[model samples]
Target chain A: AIRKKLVIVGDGACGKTCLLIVFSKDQFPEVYVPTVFENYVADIEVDGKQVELALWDTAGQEDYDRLRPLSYPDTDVILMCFSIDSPDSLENIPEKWTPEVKHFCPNVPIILVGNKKDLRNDEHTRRELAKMKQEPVKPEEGRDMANRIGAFGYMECSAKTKDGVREVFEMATRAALQ
Target chain B: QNWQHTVGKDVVAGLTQREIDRQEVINELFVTEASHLRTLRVLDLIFYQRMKKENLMPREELARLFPNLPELIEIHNSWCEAMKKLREEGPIIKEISDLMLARFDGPAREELQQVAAQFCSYQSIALELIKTKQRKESRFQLFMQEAESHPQCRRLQLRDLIISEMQRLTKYPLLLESIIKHTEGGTSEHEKLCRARDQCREILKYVNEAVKQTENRHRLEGYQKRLDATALERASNPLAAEFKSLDLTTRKMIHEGPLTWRISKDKTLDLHVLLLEDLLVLLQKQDEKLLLKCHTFSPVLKLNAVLIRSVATDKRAFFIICTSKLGPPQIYELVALTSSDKNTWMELLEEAVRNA
Candidate 1:
């Protein structure tokens, strides 16, 4: 069966791949494959309709720049992502991300996601950011960026905790259907 | 205005049919040069300049996206202008030896070849990156759509415009070959035209070789970064000794992908496996990090001593028997994500032990 593709892209180590790993398998994977692209077919029933949504993962590092394009064609929706603990990743949405996403996929809808949401209130995360003179990206900042880039929706999730993971994909499936 | 038609006839009036054919080729050189410059200008006004001016992306990206494009435009800008000036100077002019030699003789030749190589070498990757980014964000598509319809764009997209510039590199030889034949043998003009062709031919050769070299080097460098090692040593006496001689950096990759590890009929594990020389590395991906799969038959399997056997009834599952000082060999069963995937793992796993 032809699958509706949903690609997740963001800075390296930003939970882009595991979001799919967790959603598709119904269990959080504590490790990830640093491969070019991995396609996961998820059986979903949304709005009382059954759909097979293919969650695609892209290598987000600069070394994989040439390989990233292979994941984009036939993409039904995009998960524009960042790690909430890394505020810099959030700011890159406009400066580095929005321009790129729009260029390849003009009409595809985007769902802005802040991954590693479990880190936002953790003391270790707070101290690390404090040392760097930064803070975890706020929910307001994520929502505003969603508006800034015209994303179909905005969400925060932790692949580790599985919080808000299903909602992210549910929203993506809804956006993709349109 | 009246002189235009008469001039066209008068220019070719004294020429034989063969001579006229040569003149047509020379005219092609001029026409194409003008058209090529227009493309460069579009890349300038519509693509490069606007992208830079508006800070459409981070500053670093614009520089990488259009490498040496401005310098390329500058070189052709001067040459095209001179060609236009030479055109109006005399109505029936035929030769441009001075112009050819002038533009291509020294620094310009070096720069031309450099840009040609850069453009040819980089355009493909640039398009891929651009497409990736285009797929990355939604706004860039709107920006590009607007750019494509701009009056100056003439409906041609940036990738096509960049492709046209590379196409211009091959065109010089075609134009030069025809014109060289028409010019008198051994004359200064003929020698210069011949020399011009040689220069472009050399540039074409360099660009081709550069592209091939870049391709092979990329292949070499690409897989170099995969399967970064982690938690290399285990605590147990049997497992700890498995990694002693292994240096992950020096080892070559055989095959790798996602797999399923069977714990029992009721429980199965999701993980990725890497087959390297003398080692079968199992991993669990937590977010984007690769950690050693901490349970079952150990994360690092020494391929030299381990045994792989396919399950009798299941095509997608297999057993790995690893021996130690203790009881019988510890057995672990692995299931492939696909039936074909099962064969590759077993094939590569078998080969690695034989060669190890």
Candidate 2:
């Protein structure tokens, strides 16, 4: 139905595939198949309005870095997934890994999602909020790049536990509508 | 919240689980180095035993027994350092003594010792070979080089090496944390766990910091040319009369003048069109006569597309409509490439943006 496109990006195995599964089927598997340019479509209602959102999943590792730019399209939302367990996933999202997406897809609102909430446990509890506050700033060097390109805002979400998962999509719609 | 399962389990059962998981991660990191060291240690022991038995071990025979010694040494050092912190505590001599008496050392030690002995023997053979023939390659070195050259093992070994190093860098602190958690009980244990977890997180922070620096370095070298091309293209967009760049948040429902999308209740398609329109306008404002070219979409086959459009003047304009709706509507534009005049495009874009 030519649903709105939402691209899910980050390092490979950043729980994006699982999130798609969960969001679609409301179930997760212990073993996640590696994504090879995988995308999903679902009909969702926001503010009592029915909308079709296509979730585009992209690879994040060096070998797959070439595939990232493809995720930048007429996407209504950008979920930049990073595994809280793996810091490099987060590191790669901004400048080094997905700069092309940021540059080529300016004005496309982006929401930073730190996935793998199920795996976080007390490990992240130690310094969750503190770490979160500094995260976007660490990528500040990319700020100029982002500003030049037109990124919306940076937010974090966990797909495993569905933490902030729906909000990411819902808010993006709200933001896009405004 | 009941503590019913605490009766038969070890006092440090929870701690052990944490440590065991962490240890497993550590063990995975050194799997290769561990195996290599095993070989080297075996060779060293073999040379010692052989020498003792024959009263002389020939360098030539040793060379055959162990080759690639230099590389082995380098690898062993890395392996050792990987476990340096955990090993540095030296298993707590007193605790080791008690634990030694308590458990079956015969299994773990026998296995480790056998591997270590072979590793040492292999090294001895390679060293002796080099001593006599002065060959560049030792047993470990030969093995490593061979592995690297072999199409089957080369890439795997490289991948293993990186995984090992990264694992070690990320896992050590977690192991320490597990211990702290075990030592502290009840609320204290919780606090300790919190602290240890924080420390582990800190380790990750540092590792990411290092990765950032390294990635930047690699990207600078690899992307220098593309970046320059990108800069040049961005500079030319303004010179052309087709593209007009605008600052509208794709996440926000921004509509001006006659442009409005009766977005679906889901607003997904509306978001998509809104982003595309944003890019088109930006391009038109730049060069009225600019022809859009080559815009690629990602995530394999999808609705992502880019194009160049003509603006008001003969100067060409480029429009990039890159949209992401994973969470928020983030629309962006990469500098457009105006077809027909590559140099002029570069020159114009160079003047459009600073450092272009």
Candidate 3:
């Protein structure tokens, strides 16, 4: 039995809450699985080792920056998220998030997550971005950020579809162990 | 110091940051409840009662426009008083939470639920009559014009007062969410707060759905007015028979949007479609935004009796087969303007049809 802490930081409305909520609540055929603790905590078993993971979700707005550091301490791993539909969220990765996460949770494993995978190819999303002369973050863009930030891994997921969501937590668990 | 004038110093002291923030949320619940009760009171006493006193409008019409004025005020007035007696004692946190728990858990909840349901149920009618009387009855407008300027009314009109009733219901769940967030879990207190929040959440659910239905129902009513009930003279489907004398209110509208419909291989018509509780309605469309010049008609399909098939080639097209006791199965092909629209309709149609 072990306990690991994971903190998620990103621009506001970047699907950070949904990533935790979907993984914790959306498991199929295992609807009876109960949380060992709070809603923000999830009980996960990776490699047959039971671990209770505490999900520390941060407010990434500039006004909340002063308080965001409080979530970084005692962190075993970090999840940095950005919405695929929002290109500016991806650009903020290095300009704002990377430095803040590195400064506060130095030496902690950082997992880069590109949320809203289901919307990457959405026609409405494309038209919306095209309205502003932009497009969704390509998978290559995520990989490049992960490399630049020296992240544990880059995972793309959609909370809407729950695609790659389960793996995101499992990978976070693996990174925590290291 | 100017800001300090509000609290006038030292009211909140020695409370944990936990209780401090929690207390503000609790205070907000109390204050806002009082505020809500006040508006309802103004709407009840000054707006409705004074009008009746002056014989400014018909009694029933006054009630129609105001909806449930007396009931709305009494509910909040009573609930606000309960919150006051709790203050008549902060760490008052326990007091407020217990008060909320008592209200939601006891017979008090039955009253709030029933009153809110009936209140929301008539909002469309309430607002609609409010407009009709203002224009149709000159005395009613004269009284409303004077009432709107009353200091007690705060220049807020009767229509806004009716709207505030539903708007206040939407705030309870939010207020309770903040309260429950700060309370420690696994405690009876937390459990009680959660129950209260759950009750508020359920009430808000009914309120929102009621409001949503009315807006859609209003539009349906509008379309019914512009419809050619007897379009079957040029049409062939039995649907025209029902369309001529159609009752739209009973159906809960599910989804609606403009869809492109194909009548024949080459004869295509743009349609405004409504997916009802379990029925699909299609109406002929045109003009920059106005519905048709006077009347246009299309077929309505019951999901339970219809067949839906996706087109293999077009991402934006699908076919629906309607077989009747009257004739051959009429296959209607529809194409959406976007791939997403087709995907949504296809998904909702299959689910609704299967359940139907």
Q: Interface RMSD (Å), each candidate?
A: 19.2, 13.8, 17.8
Candidate 3 has which clashing residue pairs, if any?
none
- How do all models score by TM-score? 0.44, 0.31, 0.58
Instruction: Report lDDT (CA) for all predictions.
Output: 0.71, 0.40, 0.70
In model 3, the fraction of reference contacts reproduced equals: 0.00
TM-score of chain B of each: 0.61, 0.30, 0.79
TM-score of 1: 0.44
Model 3's CAPRI class is: incorrect
| Best prediction by TM-score | 3
Please identify model 3 stretches exceeding 4 Å from their true place: A1-178, B1-13, B136-138, B211-257, B285-298, B307-318, B322-330, B335-347
TM-score of chain B of 3: 0.79
Which ten residues in a row are the worst by lDDT in model 3 chain A?
Answer: A30-39
TM-score of 3: 0.58
Interface RMSD of 3: 17.8
**Candidates sorted by lDDT, descending order?**
1, 3, 2
DockQ of each: 0.01, 0.03, 0.02
Across residues A1-178, which tens digit of lDDT does each residue of candidate 2 receive? 3347676766655676667766665544333221222234567778877776765554333232222332354557776666666655655665343445555566667766656655545455436645765322233433443453345654445555666667667766655544
- Estimate the lDDT of model 1: 0.71
What digit string (tens of lDDT, one per residue) describes model 3 on residues B182-290?
7778888888888887886665555555556655777777666666545554455445555545666677777777788777668787888888877787766644332
> Model 3 misses residue B121 by how many Å?
2.4
On DockQ, the stronger of 1 and 3 is 3
Which residue ranges in model 1 land beyond 4 Å of their true spot? A1-178, B1-7, B213-219, B227-356
